[PDB]
RNA sequence: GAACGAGACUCAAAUAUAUUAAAUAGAUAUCUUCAGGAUUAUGGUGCUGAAGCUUAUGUAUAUGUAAGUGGAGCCGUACCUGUUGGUUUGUCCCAUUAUAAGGACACUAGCUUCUUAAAUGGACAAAUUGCGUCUAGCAAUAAUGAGAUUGAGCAAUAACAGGUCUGUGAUGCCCUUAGAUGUCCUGGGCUGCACGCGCGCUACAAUGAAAGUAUCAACGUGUAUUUCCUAGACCGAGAGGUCCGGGUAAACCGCUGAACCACUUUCAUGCUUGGGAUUGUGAACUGAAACUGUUCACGAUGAACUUGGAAUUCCCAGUAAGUGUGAGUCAUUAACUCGCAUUGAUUACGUCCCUGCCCUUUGUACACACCGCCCG
């Protein structure tokens, strides 16, 4: 039976909640297409069920262990970004402050004027490979 | 050589002693014409010929 | 239309190899007013095809 | 006997088309279960003429790269689709696919003379040997186009047409070219 | 041993076919000499041959075994 | 020494062709480091005969 | 233009419509299950388990990614 | 497919028409067996070449 | 094959092949080497482990 | 009598293991924990406190289980399966530390099919209604493991202004060396990128994709101032860490028990978990030392691509193509090439159109040879 939410909505984007959860819940930006099996088993929803339910009564509890990754049983390397090192807070950011300190990331290149972040300002292909013929 | 290495490489590395000799043959002793060699590894002592045109050479 | 088909003899591969390895038709009515068409596909003795048309002859028999 | 394929039979099936049978020892002196002969059908001119219509559509679903070098798996998939056929009407593939390749072959002329300065010149008669050895070819066609982004899967889309090639226009999978370059052919003589 | 999958499985339904050419040859039964390839010359299902295909030598020059990689300019 | 640089036992150079001193063309598959071209005519005589 | 709009969705609000179906089906299949509207293949996993009655339905066999459905008719 | 036996065979061919007339008759595997000593076949697998003509020989 | 290998690609191969065969024994100690060097001659270096 | 080239020969492998035959590989029998078949045969026997489980637990884990409990089980034997290990000159031994020989006995109580090529073994077609001409009735598919296992190595005459002086202690002459081009002392570069071009890899998915679950390779490589193949524990999400073992190799990895393919579930064909380009942080590895980078995983990002214009490649059978693995250089890094196995089709079974190459006949005013010569 489909008859209760057909959508839903989270922080920072409205959750297209029509695939099963196993393949929809990763449509948050800062989650794997496996990191959402890693915490929603963790989060004690049924991985089976489609996301017409799993609302509210759910989603309860899947908010506030993104902000709280490391009191929720996560060990830090199978987190996103551990190793700031700047607080040395080994965090998670998630579709608003995945963007927010990206810049400010390489405003320290720019800082620093190492050339990783030149690249990152000249345009480039992101690694150090050849540019005879990449280039573009 | 005091190592146990194999046959794989025992019929190189003292295989090519015979090469890395045909030349030096060739090269030192080039006064006499220098034909050919035969060698036979025997136990506790090895001896290898050399055929010549000038053999008191 | 289904008019029948059996054949005589597979030659050289005319048409500029195309392999069109013409055949002296014969029918299955008469014997003798039985004539040349220039087929595609390789033939053996024996094989009973049924032919549309019956007019063309293909003149051209190398 | 050795009949019962995996299912049904392999007997009481024989069309005569006049004067068109003659075709091939297909099955009846050749009875089988399944189609996996190993390797050796590309020896001399014609070996597959003494070679029924049933082996060759069983290989012949190996193309694009992916999906060649897979026969048993191919012959999975239209062993499953053969009781798609027992659900159409309840009718066996034999008499389905030998009365598809009746129609489903390009009946006796096509078009090419195409190494002269045109090409229109065209074949008087096609070799029953060469109608079916495409015949299995076109509607392998119309599987991977049925088959190919959204419409509905591999197992049962080839067995989609083959009654439906038992005779003529349906749609385009495959009866259209069959019939488009026939009326070509007699545009062109 | 040997092989992958299908070429065992091909090579067992060759056992019991090797075998009973050479196990009813010698005490069980006569008539199980030409009626053990009436069955098997109206079939013969590969099954007394020893079969001389195998993978032949890839050659210098490419990568197939008779295929070798070109369309450098002509 | 002092300014005695490159402990060369990492890559091939330079612990490189005894024979011949060909710096980019060894070979190694038994350990012999004879520049392979020269190789190529030293075959005979070490065994290495072409059987095919 | 099948692009289905279509959330991935159970709905029993048209299983007393699921059976309207069987006469006079005959090949029913997750992928002719396109013949219904909103058409789904990862709950139609689902949609069609309690389809084996044994008794105006009918079935061959259950395969990955293969599943073929048919009336036990007369 | 040569349709006669190509290549040299005449140093056996034509030597036993006086001197090896009899000492071998119309059977193949025979003349098989006489080949390997009336002359010393050095490499021997061309024995059979040197000795399956006499099929066509005595035939014609 | 070629050195400076510029032009018209192709290889060469070296095949060399050590065959060896086997010969059990159950006998006293000395009995062997009393055949020490016959038949000695290049190509063959004999082994025999007395254990 | 010409002679070389080509044939012929040489290798792999198909092929008879008849013969020679075993650290290995083994078929075979024998023996090693009733191996469930009281659903092939059978006994002490079962509702009568038995197996099982409860309590206190006896090294401040033997845990039997009698007692609690339980309602019926514990115990006998086997044709078949399933076994440590031992029967390759044996069953007892003589002898010997023990094996072999010595005896009886089988009087072979593990042999030569496979693994292993040692040597031999193996295609010639007699016959094809037409005086194809008293010479090729090649319709004998047959016959046959085989019409070659058929793939390869060698490769003449003639030369090119083919490539290499940066394969070398092959080298002329040239050049520079007390102001070195050498030799290198350090680092950078050969990896610089608006672009053109080349061979490739990965994919553009529902024959698929995803997590499990079934299970088979072959070619071979394998450490010795050792730095290699690797077993088996330990510690690790993993990368990788500790401590020991085998294999100088048919012995150990290793039944080299590889990968698609097989089955089941999860995704429904959404530019989506198809695809992984890009990119941040951490965790590591070798190299004294790692940055337009030396590689390797973990979370995260999810670019183009929905099959590719003009054109243009490779190939006729275990081939193409799919899928792996070995080896090469290798401290570390393979998308590369040299091998190898595995899956295994289509479509010819042929012509000279296309583009080349040969043969002559023929034209020529060309002969650094039609990229010619050459006219106003």
Same mark, same amino acid.
């Given at each position: 039976?489909?008859?209760?939410?057909?959508?839903?909505?989270?922080?920072?984007?409205?959750?297209?909640?029509? @695939?099963?959860?196993?393949?929809?819940?990763?449509?948050?930006?800062?989650?794997?297409?496996?990191?959402?099996?890693?915490?929603?088993?963790?989060?004690?929803?049924? &991985?089976?069920? @489609?996301?017409?339910?799993?609302?509210?009564?759910?989603?309860?509890?899947?908010?506030?262990?993104?902000?709280?990754?490391?009191?929720?049983?996560?060990?830090?390397?199978?987190?996103?970004?551990?190793?700031?090192?700047?607080?040395?807070?080994?965090?998670?950011?998630?579709?608003?402050?995945? *963007?927010?300190?990206?810049?400010?990331?390489?405003?320290?290149?720019?800082?620093?004027?190492?050339?990783?972040?030149?690249?990152?300002?000249?345009?480039?292909?992101?690694?150090?490979?050849?540019?005879?013929?990449?280039? @573009? | 050589?005091?190592?146990?290495?194999?046959?794989?490489?025992?019929?190189?590395?003292?295989?090519?002693?015979? +090469?890395?000799?045909?030349? $030096?043959?060739?090269?030192?002793?080039?006064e006499d014409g220098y034909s050919g060699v035969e060698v036979r590894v025997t136990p506790s002592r090895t001896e290898i010929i050399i055929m010549a045109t000038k053999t008191q050479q | 239309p289904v008019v029948w088909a059996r054949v005589m003899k597979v030659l050289g591969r005319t048409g500029s190899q195309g392999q069109c390895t013409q055949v002296k038709?014969?029918?299955?009515?008469?014997?003798?007013?039985?004539?040349?068409?220039?087929?595609?596909?390789?033939?053996?003795?024996?094989?009973?095809? =049924?032919?549309?048309?019956?007019?063309?002859?293909?003149?051209?028999?190398? | 006997?050795?009949?019962?394929?995996?299912?049904?039979?392999?007997?009481?099936?024989?069309?005569?088309?006049?004067?068109?049978?003659?075709?091939?020892?297909?099955?009846?002196?050749?009875?089988?279960?399944?189609?996996?002969?190993?390797?050796?059908?590309?020896?001399?001119?014609?070996?597959?003429?003494?070679?029924?219509?049933?082996?060759?559509?069983?290989?012949?679903?190996?193309?694009?790269?992916?999906?060649?070098?897979?026969? &048993? &798996?191919?012959?999975?998939?239209?062993?499953?689709?053969?009781?798609?056929?027992?659900?159409?009407?309840?009718?066996?593939?034999?008499?389905?696919?030998?009365?598809?390749?009746?129609?489903?072959?390009?009946?006796?002329?096509?078009?090419?003379?195409?190494?002269?300065?045109?090409?229109?010149?065209?074949?008087? *008669?096609?070799?029953?040997?060469?109608?079916?050895?495409?015949?299995?070819?076109?509607?392998?066609?119309?599987?991977?186009? +049925?088959?190919?982004?959204?419409?509905?899967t591999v197992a049962e889309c080839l067995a989609d047409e083959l009654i439906n090639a038992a005779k003529g226009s349906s749609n385009s999978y495959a009866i259209k070219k069959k019939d488009e370059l026939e009326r070509v052919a007699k545009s062109n003589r | 041993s040997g092989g992958g999958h299908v070429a065992q499985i091909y090579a067992i339904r060759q056992?019991?076919?090797? +075998?009973?050419?050479? $196990? #009813?040859?010698?005490?069980?039964?006569?008539?199980?000499?030409?009626?053990?390839?009436?069955?098997?010359?109206?079939?013969?299902?590969?099954?007394?041959?020893?079969?001389?295909?195998? !993978?032949?030598?890839?050659? $210098?020059?490419?990568?197939?075994?008779?295929?070798? #990689?070109?369309?450098?300019?002509? | 020494?002092?300014?005695?640089?490159?402990?060369?036992?990492?890559?091939?150079?330079?612990?490189?062709?005894?024979? !011949?001193?060909?710096?980019?063309?060894?070979?190694?598959? #038994?350990?012999?480091?004879?520049?392979?071209? !020269?190789?190529?005519? #030293?075959?005979?005589?070490?065994? $290495?005969?072409?059987?095919? | 233009?099948?692009?289905?709009?279509?959330?991935?969705?159970? *709905?029993? +609000?048209?299983?007393?419509?699921?059976?309207?179906?069987?006469?006079?089906?005959?090949?029913? =299949?997750?992928?002719?299950?396109?013949?219904?509207?909103?058409?789904?293949?990862?709950?139609?996993?689902?949609?069609?388990?309690?389809?084996?009655?044994?008794?105006l339905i009918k079935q061959v066999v259950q395969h990955h990614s293969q599943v073929i459905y048919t009336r036990a008719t007369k | 497919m040569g349709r006669v036996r190509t290549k040299t065979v005449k140093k056996a061919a034509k030597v036993i028409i006086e001197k090896y007339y009899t000492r071998l008759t119309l059977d193949f595997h025979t003349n098989k067996?006489?080949?390997?000593?009336?002359?010393?076949?050095?490499?021997?697998? &061309?024995?059979?070449?040197?000795?399956?003509?006499?099929?066509?020989?005595?035939?014609? | 094959?070629?050195? !400076?290998?510029?032009?018209?690609? =192709?290889?060469?191969?070296?095949?060399?092949?050590?065959?060896?065969?086997?010969?059990?024994?159950?006998?006293?100690?000395?009995?062997?080497?009393?055949? =020490?060097?016959?038949?000695?001659?290049?190509?063959?270096?004999?082994?025999?482990?007395?254990?």
């Amino acid at each position: 039976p489909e008859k209760f939410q057909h959508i839903l909505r989270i922080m920072n984007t409205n959750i297209d909640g029509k @695939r099963k959860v196993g393949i929809a819940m990763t449509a948050i930006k800062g989650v794997g297409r496996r990191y959402s099996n890693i915490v929603l088993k963790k989060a004690d929803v049924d &991985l089976t069920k @489609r996301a017409g339910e799993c609302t509210e009564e759910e989603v309860d509890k899947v908010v506030t262990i993104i902000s709280n990754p490391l009191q929720y049983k996560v060990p830090n390397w199978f987190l996103n970004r551990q190793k700031d090192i700047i607080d040395g807070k080994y965090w998670q950011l998630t579709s608003s402050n995945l *963007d927010s300190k990206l810049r400010d990331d390489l405003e320290r290149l720019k800082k620093i004027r190492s050339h990783r972040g030149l690249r990152h300002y000249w345009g480039l292909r992101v690694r150090g490979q050849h540019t005879k013929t990449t280039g @573009r | 050589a005091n190592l146990p290495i194999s046959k794989k490489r025992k019929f190189v590395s003292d295989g090519i002693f015979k +090469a890395e000799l045909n030349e $030096f043959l060739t090269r030192e002793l080039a006064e006499d014409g220098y034909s050919g060699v035969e060698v036979r590894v025997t136990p506790s002592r090895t001896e290898i010929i050399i055929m010549a045109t000038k053999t008191q050479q | 239309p289904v008019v029948w088909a059996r054949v005589m003899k597979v030659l050289g591969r005319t048409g500029s190899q195309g392999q069109c390895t013409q055949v002296k038709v014969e029918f299955l009515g008469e014997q003798n007013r039985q004539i040349i068409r220039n087929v595609k596909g390789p033939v053996r003795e024996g094989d009973i095809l =049924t032919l549309l048309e019956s007019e063309r002859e293909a003149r051209r028999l190398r | 006997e050795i009949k019962l394929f995996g299912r049904w039979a392999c007997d009481d099936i024989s069309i005569s088309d006049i004067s068109l049978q003659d075709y091939i020892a297909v099955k009846e002196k050749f009875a089988r279960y399944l189609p996996h002969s190993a390797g050796r059908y590309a020896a001399k001119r014609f070996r597959k003429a003494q070679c029924p219509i049933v082996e060759r559509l069983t290989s012949g679903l190996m193309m694009k790269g992916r999906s060649n070098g897979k026969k &048993l &798996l191919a012959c999975r998939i239209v062993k499953h689709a053969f009781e798609i056929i027992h659900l159409l009407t309840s009718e066996n593939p034999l008499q389905v696919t030998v009365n598809a390749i009746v129609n489903s072959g390009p009946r006796e002329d096509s078009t090419r003379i195409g190494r002269a300065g045109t090409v229109r010149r065209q074949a008087v *008669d096609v070799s029953p040997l060469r109608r079916v050895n495409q015949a299995i070819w076109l509607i392998c066609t119309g599987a991977r186009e +049925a088959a190919f982004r959204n419409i509905k899967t591999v197992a049962e889309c080839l067995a989609d047409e083959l009654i439906n090639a038992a005779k003529g226009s349906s749609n385009s999978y495959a009866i259209k070219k069959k019939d488009e370059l026939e009326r070509v052919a007699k545009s062109n003589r | 041993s040997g092989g992958g999958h299908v070429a065992q499985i091909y090579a067992i339904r060759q056992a019991i076919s090797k +075998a009973l050419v050479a $196990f #009813y040859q010698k005490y069980v039964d006569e008539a199980s000499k030409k009626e053990i390839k009436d069955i098997l010359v109206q079939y013969d299902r590969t099954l007394l041959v020893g079969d001389p295909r195998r !993978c032949e030598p890839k050659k $210098f020059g490419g990568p197939g075994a008779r295929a070798r #990689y070109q369309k450098s300019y002509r | 020494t002092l300014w005695y640089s490159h402990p060369r036992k990492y890559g091939q150079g330079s612990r490189c062709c005894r024979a !011949c001193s060909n710096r980019h063309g060894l070979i190694r598959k #038994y350990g012999l480091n004879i520049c392979r071209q !020269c190789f190529r005519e #030293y075959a005979n005589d070490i065994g $290495f005969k072409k059987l095919d | 233009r099948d692009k289905l709009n279509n959330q991935v969705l159970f *709905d029993k +609000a048209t299983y007393e419509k699921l059976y309207k179906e069987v006469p006079a089906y005959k090949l029913i =299949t997750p992928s002719v299950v396109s013949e219904r509207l909103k058409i789904r293949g990862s709950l139609a996993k689902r949609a069609l388990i309690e389809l084996r009655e044994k008794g105006l339905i009918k079935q061959v066999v259950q395969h990955h990614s293969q599943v073929i459905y048919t009336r036990a008719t007369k | 497919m040569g349709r006669v036996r190509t290549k040299t065979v005449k140093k056996a061919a034509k030597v036993i028409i006086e001197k090896y007339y009899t000492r071998l008759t119309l059977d193949f595997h025979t003349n098989k067996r006489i080949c390997e000593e009336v002359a010393i076949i050095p490499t021997k697998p &061309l024995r059979n070449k040197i000795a399956g003509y006499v099929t066509h020989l005595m035939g014609r | 094959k070629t050195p !400076c290998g510029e032009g018209s690609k =192709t290889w060469d191969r070296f095949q060399m092949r050590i065959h060896k065969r086997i010969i059990d024994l159950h006998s006293p100690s000395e009995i062997v080497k009393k055949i =020490t060097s016959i038949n000695i001659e290049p190509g063959v270096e004999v082994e025999v482990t007395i254990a």
